[PDB]
Amino acid sequence: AMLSGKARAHTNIALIKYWGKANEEYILPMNSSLSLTLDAFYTETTVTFDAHYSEDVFILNGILQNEKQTKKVKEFLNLVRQQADCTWFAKVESQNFVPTAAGLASSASGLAALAGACNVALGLNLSAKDLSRLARRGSGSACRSIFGGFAQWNKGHSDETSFAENIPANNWENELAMLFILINDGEKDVSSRDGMKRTVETSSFYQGWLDNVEKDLSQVHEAIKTKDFPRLGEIIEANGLRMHGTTLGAVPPFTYWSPGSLQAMALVRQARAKGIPCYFTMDAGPNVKVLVEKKNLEALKTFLSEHFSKEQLVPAFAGPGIELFET
Amino acid sequence: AMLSGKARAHTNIALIKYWGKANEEYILPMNSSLSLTLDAFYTETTVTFDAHYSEDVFILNGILQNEKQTKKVKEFLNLVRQQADCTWFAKVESQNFVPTAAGLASSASGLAALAGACNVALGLNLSAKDLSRLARRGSGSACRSIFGGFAQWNKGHSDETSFAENIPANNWENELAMLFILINDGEKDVSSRDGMKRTVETSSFYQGWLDNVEKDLSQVHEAIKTKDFPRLGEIIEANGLRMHGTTLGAVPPFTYWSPGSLQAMALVRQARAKGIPCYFTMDAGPNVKVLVEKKNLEALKTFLSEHFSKEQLVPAFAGPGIELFET
Numbered sequence: 134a135m136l137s138g139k140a141r142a143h144t145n146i147a148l149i150k151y152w153g154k155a156n157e158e159y160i161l162p163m164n165s166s167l168s169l170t171l172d173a174f175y176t177e178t179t180v181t182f183d184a185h186y187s188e189d190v191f192i193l194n195g196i197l198q199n200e201k202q203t204k205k206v207k208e209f210l211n212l213v214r215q216q217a218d219c220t221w222f223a224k225v226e227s228q229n230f231v232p233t234a235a236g237l238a239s240s241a242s243g244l245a246a247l248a249g250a251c252n253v254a255l256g257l258n259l260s261a262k263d264l265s266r267l268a269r270r271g272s273g274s275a276c277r278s279i280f281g282g283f284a285q286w287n288k289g290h291s292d293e294t295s296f297a298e299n300i301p302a303n304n305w306e307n308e309l310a311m312l313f314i315l316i317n318d319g320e321k322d323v324s325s326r327d328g329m330k331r332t333v334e335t336s337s338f339y340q341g342w343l344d345n346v347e348k349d350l351s352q353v354h355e356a357i358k359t360k361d362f363p364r365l366g367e368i369i370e371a372n373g374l375r376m377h378g379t380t381l382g383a384v385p386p387f388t389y390w391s392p393g394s395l396q397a398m399a400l401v402r403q404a405r406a407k408g409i410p411c412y413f414t415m416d417a418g419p420n421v422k423v424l425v426e427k428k429n430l431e432a433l434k435t436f437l438s439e440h441f442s443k444e445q446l447v448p449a450f451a452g453p454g455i456e457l458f459e460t
Numbered sequence: 461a462m463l464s465g466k467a468r469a470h471t472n473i474a475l476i477k478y479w480g481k482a483n484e485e486y487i488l489p490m491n492s493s494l495s496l497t498l499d500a501f502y503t504e505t506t507v508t509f510d511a512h513y514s515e516d517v518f519i520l521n522g523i524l525q526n527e528k529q530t531k532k533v534k535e536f537l538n539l540v541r542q543q544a545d546c547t548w549f550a551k552v553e554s555q556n557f558v559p560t561a562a563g564l565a566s567s568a569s570g571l572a573a574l575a576g577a578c579n580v581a582l583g584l585n586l587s588a589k590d591l592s593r594l595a596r597r598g599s600g601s602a603c604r605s606i607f608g609g610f611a612q613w614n615k616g617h618s619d620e621t622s623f624a625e626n627i628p629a630n631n632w633e634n635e636l637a638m639l640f641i642l643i644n645d646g647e648k649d650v651s652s653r654d655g656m657k658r659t660v661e662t663s664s665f666y667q668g669w670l671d672n673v674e675k676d677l678s679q680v681h682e683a684i685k686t687k688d689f690p691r692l693g694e695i696i697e698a699n700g701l702r703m704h705g706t707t708l709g710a711v712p713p714f715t716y717w718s719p720g721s722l723q724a725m726a727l728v729r730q731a732r733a734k735g736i737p738c739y740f741t742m743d744a745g746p747n748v749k750v751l752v753e754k755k756n757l758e759a760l761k762t763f764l765s766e767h768f769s770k771e772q773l774v775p776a777f778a779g780p781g782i783e784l785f786e787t
């Protein structure tokens with residue numbers, strides 16, 4: 134009386150940010166978002182549901198996770214057990230090939246992989262669309278890691294209509310790269326979930342964010358259709374700066390940036406000034422991601438090595454959607 | 461046929477920020493502001509109007525200023541010459557005891573001192589209120605350096621009704637201190653005037669700024685009446701963060717912060733956590749000012765010496781209003 138399943142999902146980095154939930158229970162977002170799934174960082178997860186288990190168990194990077202660290206996995210397991218009428222405790226064994234809780238989207242790859250493993254184990258036979266909807270319930274960004282390359286999370290207006298899909302770009306995504314500047318791989322002070330809730334509920338800047346996101350998304354789409362790299366980069370750099378601006382208007386205000394974040398951002402502007410087209414974005418933490426055409430990646434890593442070590446510059450290319458495995 | 465005059469004015473640091481002009485020609489602000497005039501940084505300026513001069517001359521720190529560097533002094537001289545019907549060129553000799561164009565309010569002390577020197581030389585016999593109105597025409601923050609201690613610039617609605625005045629605080633200002641952390645005394649990339657104009661005209665966050673400034677000012681006034689230091693510090697720290705947030709929503713966005721700015725801000729929060737009540741604010745540049753009660757100033761300088769040198773921690777106390785000199 135045992136059901137098991139496995140999946141691999143890659144991280145994604147948001148080009149147009151998701152920031153703030155319209156519905157906290159179902160993770161319905163205030164705005165639509167768009168990301169690039171990457172090849173460098175991924176999560177591998179197996180789940181086992183077994184009548185003989187006596188409690189839910191979460192093992193991450195070979196390390197048993199404590200009650201606080203398991204609360205959310207347990208929330209996702211409860212949700213999927215209701216969606217199957219399954220009453221069995223589960224064992225979740227996951228390995229993050231990506232720093233955890235550091236602004237490098239380990240919740241995207243991690244909850245996507247768990248959703249996929251659960252889909253397999255409980256024989257749910259979900260379409261990609263419906264697997265995206267389930268992953269959304271664990272972490273918003275995870276619903277986009279179901280797909281490769283460019284993916285859009287349509288905010289919709291209900292559990293049924295909020296989900297992601299691939300954005301065809303006539304192969305453009307394979308002509309691009311993202312260079313991670315690792316300022317700090319440690320666990321961050323304010324979680325993505327808590328930070329965006331504080332922003333929604335208290336930031337005087339949040340309406341400004343909302344009033345600009347759809348225009349940014351439209352221009353990202355026009356840029357894709359024309360493979361206009363400077364236009365893409367200007368939109369996404371400003372979109373990320375606008376998102377981080379919102380936390381300075383929260384009550385109390387806060388920032389995800391660290392000193393090295395600003396150093397890296399300024400350096401990206403120097404690189405542009407000195408003839409390397411590239412644009413930075415930051416998800417919810419201190420690390421800096423630099424969008425750059427593949428042909429300029431080595432140029433950029435060398436430029437940036439003047440201030441960061443080899444261990445701090447990690448390149449990445451477009452990556453695949455989720456991979457399921459019956460075991 | 462020569463008229464001469466001299467004045468000394470001290471810098472001020474805004475606790476509630478002025479950010480954005482409702483009228484660029486007359487420097488009427490979008491919101492009222494409140495500052496503390498300080499004893500550590502000041503400007504000394506002499507002006508001479510003489511029928512024999514052949515052009516306006518501006519000498520700053522013993523160095524002749526070029527055309528670009530004199531444009532604004534020339535605008536202030538033209539304005540004051542119209543207000544006297546004087547047709548004579550002038551020589552302005554000024555010494556800044558304060559880094560220039562670095563976010564340490566050298567335009568406040570400098571244009572205040574020039575306004576005072578011109579008042580003297582042309583025998584204008586201005587009330588403090590009217591001298592504040594004239595200094596306002598050279599630099600907004602300068603209209604507050606006419607007064608000592610706490611001073612408020614009332615935005616008014618016309619050249620006649622926009623001016624500053626002292627805020628009585630039952631001696632509280634003499635129980636306080638401000639510690640400057642000098643991250644970079646160099647000349648800053650974006651001027652205060654250009655930065656705030658870009659913000660007014662393009663920032664999606666500017667309305668949020670406007671919608672909160674009057675509430676901040678009110679609470680600063682209640683805190684003064686009760687000498688409530690924690691309440692003052694929380695208001696002013698959030699007000700400064702909100703002001704800097706507005707530039708991340710500008711088009712294109714920008715920041716005045718440098719890496720050391722964030723380091724210093726984080727350290728101030730550590731100091732609070734470890735039992736030293738103190739609060740940071742930043743005017744338009746990378747340097748960080750820390751409001752602190754006098755009794756905790758040495759504690760704080762020692763705490764901060766773990767990461768900054770002696771040359772980077774400059775203390776300051778409340779300072780006087782403008783001093784005029786007939787020569």
Ligand SMILES: Nc1ncnc2c1ncn2[C@@H]1O[C@H](COP(=O)(O)OP(=O)(O)O)[C@@H](O)[C@H]1O
Pocket residue numbers: 176193202205206227228229232233234235236237238239240241242243244247323324325326417418
């Ligand atoms: N492999 C995983 N399986 C389950 N939950 C995970 C996994 N990796 C990360 N998480 C969850 O994601 C949280 C981090 O979420 P978030 O604050 O969005 O950070 P990040 O920047 O890593 O995406 C972790 O503390 C944990 O709750």
Ligand SMILES: Nc1ncnc2c1ncn2[C@@H]1O[C@H](COP(=O)(O)OP(=O)(O)O)[C@@H](O)[C@H]1O
Pocket residue numbers: 503520529532533554555556559560561562563564565566567568569570571574650651652653744745
């Ligand atoms: N002593 C002075 N006399 C005249 N103008 C001055 C003086 N000191 C500074 N200024 C003017 O102020 C400008 C800096 O203004 P601002 O951008 O507000 O910088 P700050 O942070 O120093 O106040 C200088 O470039 C110059 O135009």
Ligand SMILES: C[C@@](O)(CCOP(=O)(O)OP(=O)(O)O)CC(=O)O
Pocket residue numbers: 146147149150151152160166240241271272273274275325326327415416417
């Ligand atoms: C700024 C972002 O990186 C925030 C991602 O937040 P999460 O997707 O981690 O949050 P939850 O829905 O609470 O799990 C932008 C993005 O990934 O779209």
Ligand SMILES: C[C@@](O)(CCOP(=O)(O)OP(=O)(O)O)CC(=O)O
Pocket residue numbers: 473474476477478479487493567568598599600601602652653654742743744
């Ligand atoms: C953020 C501030 O430091 C900006 C001061 O700007 P200025 O008074 O230098 O600007 P102008 O009116 O253009 O001369 C806040 C303040 O001093 O009130």
Ligand SMILES: [Co+2]
Pocket residue numbers: 238239240241272274325
């Ligand atoms: Co996340």
Ligand SMILES: [Co+2]
Pocket residue numbers: 145146147238274416417
């Ligand atoms: Co993200």
Ligand SMILES: [Co+2]
Pocket residue numbers: 565566567568599601652
């Ligand atoms: Co100034």
Ligand SMILES: [Co+2]
Pocket residue numbers: 472473474565601743744
């Ligand atoms: Co100022």
